[PDB]
Design a protein around this ligand. Structure first.
Ligand SMILES: *C1=CC(=O)N(CCCCN2C(=O)C=C(SCCNC(=O)CCNC(=O)[C@H](O)C(C)(C)COP(*)(=O)O)C2=O)C1=O
Ligand SMILES: *C1=CC(=O)N(CCCCN2C(=O)C=CC2=O)C1=O
Lengths: 444, 86, 444
């Protein structure tokens, strides 16, 4: 029922496709002249007409426009083989087998989700549903946090951050689904698996919400101050060797995430971690301690085992609608095995991301949609793809300071232009747009 | 650019970095970017920094540090470092 | 959330695909060798595994199977490039822009939707919802009629058939939608436009139900006996010429529909119509009186104009989710213009099917799903593609005496092997299928 776009949202997308690049330029120039000549044309009529009455062809370009002059700018640049900030182009050369990627922390920024609360009814609807479910288990308001009201808790607090990023990531998924982009599989990084399970339907919304709320609250109580996570731009095995120096006679530092060929996360007590980061900042290596992070995925969580199994005894896992590529046990779960023990293992075992990306590649997944507010895993996935000679698209949803329909439609165009089927017609729903006559070029 | 003066090098590398930044920004003018303006002010997150580095690596046919954009804040500074790099 | 298939239902589909026909038959023969070695392998595990873990490639087959025997049979055949009854093959060379076709009478057969009520929860749930809307306006049960219950009225009667065909068509649309195949547009033939408007949301179920019930009851009261419609396999022009022989003085016969370059419907008084059909058979021309028809799409509905306007004054047409290509006016409609007067024009105007099939080819539609119990319009469409030189798929849903999951998955495969994206994983819902290792044929 809820639409991609508020009926008064000025942003709309114009999808175009030709046989070859010259046909795409010619139709764009014709379309520009069609618009220039008639000041009375509805941008929604033309959009609906492009999205409904045009052949789907290999060479693709989407113009994201909120006005005539943004449409003439886009179609002008398109027409003279020139780039532009609001034109996304590509060849439909991918199979479009899609995996939705739910990271943990690092996606967050102040203002995330706001522009879409005000401008996307689908996003708003899903955000209300999911927020509604988390607010059974907390006293604060998810919308109020996201909108940055005076009274609202701080995102610096792991126990506010996790439930919020969960709402945002799960709500972004439903916006893709309304655009016609459904996952054929789902992957999650630590707390991202809680979102993937909600999006897969393996956990009820209510059960998923309660897990991220109770586990992040348990970490705020037991683990804040006693340890953190650091990111290091070395292969994991190289970092394992360096870690051995510290934590000689006990696990003070442990690998927390094999994220990439040259990207690993380490967890443990703050001092050992800061010593490791400085020793490595010396030898040119990109290593930093992530803020608002506890030393999960380490021995520090072993003592909370009995408390976590009781806290999450309520979870009734069930078979989901798509497979979850576990980054805990490296299996292809159907979701019915995501009980209390899984959610302990999810918070204890080092995140095995790098190998499930390779496994996904081999299984023929060639489109990676990160259902997040800023891309934390997509560049890693691209770097892995090129090191392996694979053609994939790793596509983020929103970015820092770009969190509205213009950004969504650009990300939606990233995936359409590379051969994912998209319901562009849905951009115009509820507007009473009509199909109108379009210039034909070399065809139609 | 061996048959080119130092000032000519400065100018070609500055035209390269400004063109590549404009492509990442999407303006695509290639002259819109101000050489003095810092990348932060232009609208640069960490992701835009590594995209600029990828494009400059491609164009110069060299492998550059991921932090090179952060380390040399303006196009002029990055152009000047690239004289040392190539 | 209703499921394609009952857990207990033996029928599952196995999708395969290869870079080329030889790899496809190579992969088939390798997979049969795997299945033959181990009697312990779950057909549902291998099903879900084939749906999820294998690249999506140009050259495609689906094995429809309720047993190890039918699996090895399919795969042995596929491996020896030999046709089998339970194997659909094709190359994915269509864009898969899909238009849903809704015919009128002709698709009915005894027990048409019984197997799907008994074994597809999604089809049963949608059949209950649509029937319930119809049963607000009649004293009989659509289920009872379809099942052949003793007390149930006869399908021979136009006023039972139309609403039953309405129920079956709209329900079949929802079965496709559950397998991940949704219309990019809808077309209907006479009454089939009502089913089209129901599926597109242009009419409410309640409105659409009441239109088909009341109009079919009107024609039963006013028109039965006074005329009928026949199919003739000649061009419109040559049928106009043949018609003129009977149309000496008062007109007894006229073109009711243009359906295909050599396919045409004629309406008029029964004696004239039988005489026309009888003299055509003598020559070797395919022609039949269609069973339970009246001389709709003719001057005989002219005196019903006022009564139809009064009878269908309740309708509240609205913008639907997909455009409706009107056969009556040859316009692309959002569904808000389907008022009483339109439903009169739908019952009076000769049906331009063939011209709007041409308009749909030209707007890039290369897949035509007929949401029907037996193909009536798919042959016309194909012949229309041949004459306009277009590569299209024209794909029925069910056939006479084949009305279960084996025929639906065989129609779903027909659409998939030509390059419509389908949600194969959905066929394994409820079964606790688990992804398993599959023999690799080639680099993966
Ligand atoms: C999940 C596990 C865990 O420990 N959590 C606590 C929060 C940390 C979550 N994090 C990290 O921050 C580290 C990883 S993955 C991201 C690391 N990068 C790569 O994969 C390598 C290549 N990419 C990049 O260098 C950066 O993406 C860019 C510089 C290109 C982007 O720049 P800006 O956006 O900074 C992880 O999982 C959990 O909650
Ligand atoms: C609506 C108009 C009409 O003619 N009929 C259905 C009978 C015609 C069935 N058809 C075709 O549509 C073409 C071939 C054929 O047999 C109504 O119900």
């Amino acid at each position: 029922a809820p639409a991609l776009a508020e009926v008064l949202a000025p942003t709309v997308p114009w999808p175009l496709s030709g046989k070859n690049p010259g046909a795409l330029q010619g139709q764009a120039a014709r379309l520009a002249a069609h618009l220039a000549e008639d000041h009375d044309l509805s941008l929604s009529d033309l959009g609906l007409s492009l999205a409904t009455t045009r052949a789907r062809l290999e060479h693709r370009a989407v113009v994201v426009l909120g006005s005539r002059e943004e449409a003439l700018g886009g179609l002008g640049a398109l027409g003279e083989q020139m780039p532009a900030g609001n034109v996304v182009t590509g060849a439909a050369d991918l199979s479009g087998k899609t995996v939705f990627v739910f990271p943990g922390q690092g996606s967050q920024w102040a203002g995330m989700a706001v522009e879409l609360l005000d401008s996307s009814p689908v996003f708003a609807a899903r955000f209300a549903e999911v927020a509604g479910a988390v607010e059974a288990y907390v006293d604060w308001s998810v919308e109020s946090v996201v909108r940055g009201a005076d009274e609202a808790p701080s995102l610096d607090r792991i126990e506010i951050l996790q439930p919020v990023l969960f709402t945002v990531m799960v709500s972004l998924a439903a916006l893709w689904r309304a655009a016609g982009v459904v996952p054929d599989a789902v992957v999650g990084h630590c707390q991202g698996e809680i979102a993937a399970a909600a999006v897969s339907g393996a956990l009820s919304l209510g059960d998923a919400a309660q897990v991220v709320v109770l586990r992040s609250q348990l970490f705020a109580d037991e683990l804040v101050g006693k340890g953190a996570v650091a990111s290091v731009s070395l292969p994991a095995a190289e970092v394992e060797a360096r870690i051995a120096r510290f934590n000689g006679d006990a696990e003070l530092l442990s690998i927390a995430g094999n994220n990439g060929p040259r990207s690993v996360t380490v967890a443990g007590q703050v001092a050992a971690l800061e010593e490791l980061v400085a020793e490595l900042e010396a030898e040119g290596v990109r290593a930093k301690v992530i803020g608002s992070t506890v030393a999960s995925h380490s021995a520090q969580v072993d003592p909370l085992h009995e408390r976590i199994l009781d806290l999450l005894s309520f979870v009734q896992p069930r078979e989901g609608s798509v497979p979850l590529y576990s980054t805990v046990n490296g299996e292809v779960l159907n979701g019915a095995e995501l009980d209390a023990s899984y959610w302990f293992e999810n918070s204890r075992r080092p995140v095995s991301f790098e190998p499930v990306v390779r496994a996904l590649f081999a299984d023929g997944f060639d489109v990676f949609v990160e259902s997040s507010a800023h891309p934390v895993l997509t560049y890693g996935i691209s770097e892995t793809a090129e090191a392996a000679g694979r053609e994939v698209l790793a596509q983020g949803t929103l970015r820092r300071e770009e969190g509205g329909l213009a950004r969504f439609y650009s990300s939606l165009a990233g995936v359409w232009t590379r051969g994912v089927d998209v319901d562009w017609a849905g951009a115009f729903a509820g507007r009473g747009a009509r199909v109108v006559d379009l210039p034909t070029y070399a065809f139609q | 650019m061996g048959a080119a003066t130092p000032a000519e090098r400065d100018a070609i590398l500055l035209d390269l970095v400004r063109g590549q930044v404009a492509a990442v920004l999407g303006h695509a003018s290639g002259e819109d970017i101000e050489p003095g303006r810092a990348f932060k002010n232009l609208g640069f997150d960490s992701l835009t920094a590594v995209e600029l580095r990828d494009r400059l690596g491609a164009a110069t046919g060299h492998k550059l540090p991921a932090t090179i954009v952060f380390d040399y804040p303006n196009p002029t500074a990055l152009a000047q470092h690239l004289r040392a790099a190539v």
